[PDB]
Amino acid sequence: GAMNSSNYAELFNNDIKLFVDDTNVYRVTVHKTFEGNVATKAINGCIFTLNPKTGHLFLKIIHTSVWAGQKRLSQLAKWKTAEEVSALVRSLPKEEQPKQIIVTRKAMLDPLEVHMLDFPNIAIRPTELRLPFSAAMSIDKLSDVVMKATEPQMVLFNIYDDWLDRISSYTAFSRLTLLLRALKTNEESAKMILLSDPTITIKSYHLWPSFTDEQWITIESQMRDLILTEYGRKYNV
Amino acid sequence: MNTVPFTSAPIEVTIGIDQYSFNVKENQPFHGIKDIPIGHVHVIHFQHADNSSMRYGYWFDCRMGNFYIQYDPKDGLYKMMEERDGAKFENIVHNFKERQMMVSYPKIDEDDTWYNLTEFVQMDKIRKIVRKDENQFSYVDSSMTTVQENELSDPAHSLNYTVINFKSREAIRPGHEMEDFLDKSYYLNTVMLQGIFKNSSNYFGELQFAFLNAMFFGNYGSSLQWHAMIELICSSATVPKHMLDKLDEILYYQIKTLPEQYSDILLNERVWNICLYSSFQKNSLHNTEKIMENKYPELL
Ligand SMILES: CC(=O)N1CCc2ccccc2[C@@H]1CC(=O)O
């Protein structure tokens, strides 16, 4: 069935599960041609596949060569996503394979089910959570590795850095979604909040700054304020 | 012309014979149906007046034997039986007529409808979908589930239609996932036509049998199978041309025969909008499209 806020804590139990977000797979810039027309140019994209309990992110970079000579690219992108996720699962040992894959967009259900026919015990499900994983490319180090790629490439990250040493998976996922929601809502101001103090650094091997416990509380408040401020601006409240 | 005598009619019932129907009152003097255009196939079906739950009936071919109906007061239904003593049967059917207590199969000479609906239906294939080898006729009712449905609980009482599942390994070649899901031609031509049904005649026969079980008994699994077999053809970009042109005729007569007030339950909006307006074969069903629009425009 579909995932929602009733069975929300289930996300952090011991059944391995993976979120799959396909919104950054096919990416284009829209520009004007010489005859005056408008043309698209693809840029590298990525599949965002995230185990929410451990933070592990399987970032499959989708290089623009995938699209060459192909038609109906927004349709193809869903099937290419499904092909790559299936391949990822197949590459894994059985005890590391996911029992469930949750797709953030319902259009991914049939492509993924078809590609996963060899795994009839892996449940493929939509979600009613509005998750902000489309803003993954607002994370500088993710955007940089995607744009620099010259061929298809899989990159592994822990999107929680070392947070699980100090907080629970539930709490880490809430912090992640708050940060990404803020980045999606006002990217430049969210980045200001995070990079405001040059004395707090991002480790070479991390994605986010090395905040103390109390600094994270402050940062989270500031991100909640940014989101609420933007809501009021948008709806005149 | 063959005859299906009835021993009696102890309970009030609506009796269908092929596309026709009539009513019999409780304990009315009624001794069956005469003047039946022998064909290759017939169906006789029942819906009891005092309980319209369970419609049920029997598919039969008059050329396979002499059949009659007798009410069973223990199981509470009209049962088909075969009379193996031919001299006895001839004695009855020449007399019951001679008493005039039978209804005449009312065939208009212009009406070709029953054969247009059952052209490809054959008893030998019916008896493989409905497994009961001790009888030459086959019982179907409103409640019987299909083998496919069972896979998602008595195998003796199942409808063994060919399983069609668009999201199955049988339907999708590894390495051709998108191709075969978006164009079901492989599954139609290699798997179903060449592999399982062997020819289009057997395919159309099961499609026609499923339609008729859905319409005459309100059998839900038969309706699913009918729609699945239509959608498989329509969703294939490559279909022999003889098959497409014949499909249009088959579906036209099915739509023409459907009760007008049964549309909310016998026609799947998604399948029909897809087949008539979106699918590879949208422009290949001209006559079916025309009857559907002018008879059921609300579904589309
Ligand atoms: C499915 C999933 O998230 N895996 C399994 C495969 C894998 C491979 C390399 C690094 C991390 C992982 C993680 C670790 C884990 O969650 O148990």
- All structural domains of chain A, each given as residue ranges with its CATH number in brackets, are 9-163 (3.30.420.230), 164-237 (1.20.80.40)
Residues in CB range of A143: below 8 A, 6 or more apart: A137
Which long-range contacts does A214-218 make (Cβ < 8 Å, 24+ apart)? Answer: A216/A175
| Helices and strands of chain A, counted as H and E runs | 6, 8
The total number of residues shown for chain B amounts to: 300
Residues B46, B78: contact at Cβ < 8 Å?
A: yes
**CA-CA-CA-CA torsion for B274, B278, B284, B287, nearest 10 degrees?**
60
- The backbone torsions φ and ψ at residue A33, rounded to the nearest 5 degrees and listed phi first, read -85, -170
Q: For residue B60, list its beta bridge partners.
A: B42
H or E stretch at A214: helix A213-235
Size of interface A-B (CB pairs under 8 A): 23
Q: What single DSSP character describes residue A8?
A: -
Q: For residue A60, list its beta bridge partners.
A: A47, A154
Of A76, A114, A118, the CB nearest to B181: A114
Question: Could you report how far apart the first and last alpha carbons of chain A are, in Å?
Answer: 36
- Residue B172 touches partner A, C-beta closer than 8 Å: yes
Whole-angstrom distance, CA of residue B196 vs CA of residue B191: 6
CATH number at residue B136: 1.25.40.550
Using the Cα atoms of residue A21, residue A26, residue A30 and residue A31 in order, give the sign of their dihedral. positive
Whole-angstrom distance, CA of residue B107 vs CA of residue B102: 15
Whole-angstrom distance, CA of residue B195 vs CA of residue B198: 6
Q: Please give the single-letter amino acid code of residue A2.
A: A
Structural tokens at position B94: 């020449």
- Technique employed here was X-ray
The position carrying tokens 């795994």 is: A119
Residues A138, A48: contact at Cβ < 8 Å?
A: no
Q: Report CA-CA distances (Å) from A25 to A146, B94, B161.
A: 11, 79, 41
Whole-angstrom distance, CA of residue B266 vs CA of residue B261: 10
**CA-CA-CA-CA torsion for A108, A111, A116, A121, nearest 10 degrees?**
50
**CA nearest ligand 1 atom 5, residue:** A96
Whole-angstrom distance, CA of residue B119 vs CA of residue A135: 60
Residues B84, B95: contact at Cβ < 8 Å?
A: no
| DSSP string of B137-171, one letter each residue | SEEEETTPPBHHHHT---GGG-B-PPP--SSSGGG
Using the Cα atoms of residue A66, residue A67, residue A69 and residue A71 in order, give the sign of their dihedral. positive
- Residue B14 CB burial class (10 angstroms; 0-12, 13-18, ≥19): middle
Whole-angstrom distance, CA of residue B133 vs CA of residue B131: 6
Whole-angstrom distance, CA of residue B207 vs CA of residue B201: 10
- Per DSSP, the three-state class of B16 is strand
Q: Taking a contact as any Cβ pair under 8 Å apart, which residues of chain A between 99 and 118 contact chain B? A: 110-111, 113-115, 117-118
- Per DSSP, the three-state class of B106 is coil
- Residue A82 touches partner B, C-beta closer than 8 Å: yes
Using the Cα atoms of residue B207, residue B211, residue B216 and residue B220 in order, give the sign of their dihedral. positive
Chain A nearest CA to B172, separation (Å): 8
Whole-angstrom distance, CA of residue A156 vs CA of residue A54: 12
The position carrying tokens 């933007």 is: A230
Residues B33, B44: contact at Cβ < 8 Å?
A: yes
Beta strand A56-62 with A153-158: parallel, antiparallel or unpaired?
antiparallel
- The backbone torsions φ and ψ at residue B248, rounded to the nearest 5 degrees and listed phi first, read -55, -40
Tell me the chain A residues in contact with residue B181 when contact means C-beta distances shorter than 8 Å. Answer: 110-111, 114
Whole-angstrom distance, CA of residue A135 vs CA of residue A143: 10
The parent domain of residue B174 ranges over 116-299
Which residue is closest to A111 within chain B, CA to CA? B178
Structural tokens at position A147: 């744009």
Angle at the Cα of B82 (from B77 to B83), degrees rounded to 5? Answer: 120
- The backbone torsions φ and ψ at residue A188, rounded to the nearest 5 degrees and listed phi first, read -65, -40
The position carrying tokens 């829209």 is: A30
| Structure's resolution in angstroms | 1.5
Structural tokens at position A170: 């539930």
Find the A56 Cα to ligand 1 centroid distance in Å: 6
Q: For residue B24, list its beta bridge partners.
A: B13
Residues B11, B26: contact at Cβ < 8 Å?
A: yes
Phi-psi region of B54 (alpha: psi -120 to 50; beta: other; left: phi over 0): left
- The backbone torsions φ and ψ at residue B262, rounded to the nearest 5 degrees and listed phi first, read -100, 10
Of A76, A83, A117, the CB nearest to B172: A117
